[PDB]
Amino acid sequence: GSDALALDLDGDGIETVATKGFSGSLFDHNRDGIRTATGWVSADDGLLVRDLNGNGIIDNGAELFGDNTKLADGSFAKHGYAALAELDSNGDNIINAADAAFQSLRVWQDLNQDGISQANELRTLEELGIQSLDLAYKDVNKNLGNGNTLAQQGSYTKTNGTTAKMGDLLLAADNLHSRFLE
Ligand SMILES: [Ca+2]
Ligand SMILES: [Ca+2]
Ligand SMILES: [Ca+2]
Ligand SMILES: [Ca+2]
Ligand SMILES: [Ca+2]
């Protein structure tokens, strides 16, 4: 679908726009591809991702964090942020540099908004200067404009000692195309 998890990377809130990058050709009810976006995360911010095949290649709808990812028994999550709680190794309730999954997590920033993730568009948490993520959030259910939404918001720490927002989003999309494709 179009449900997502994102980080505020430059420290002024998670922000979204209408799509214009790839939108000069739109997918249709028989042409296979990715579900047609009308809005997306603006390039100062990034999506939280993981290759579930461990080679650092994002291609499937579970590889985005969001309500279409699964928990450690194979169940879908009720809220995509809570799927991060399976990844804490020691039970301190932070995702930090001592957890194995900290190296497996990545962040995606797409400048062309084509819905495919390519290798230059990805960041590891250490290359992104992240030190920890909090497994704690509040429900905010806030509009972001252009049909986009922020459901829930938590927090993260940078290696430079700055702290910033992270959260669960709904991104704007074509409703019929989002039923022809997942
Ligand atoms: Ca921002
Ligand atoms: Ca994959
Ligand atoms: Ca959600
Ligand atoms: Ca931990
Ligand atoms: Ca791309």
Curated annotation (Swiss-Prot):
It comes from the Bacteria. It is found in: Cell outer membrane; Secreted. Signal peptide: none annotated. Disulfide bonds: none annotated. The Gly-rich region is probably involved in binding calcium, which is required for target cell-binding or cytolytic activity. Belongs to the RTX prokaryotic toxin (TC 1.C.11) family. May participate in the pathogenesis of meningococcal disease. This is Iron-regulated protein FrpC. The gene is frpC. The chain holds residues 416 to 591 of 1829 of the full protein.
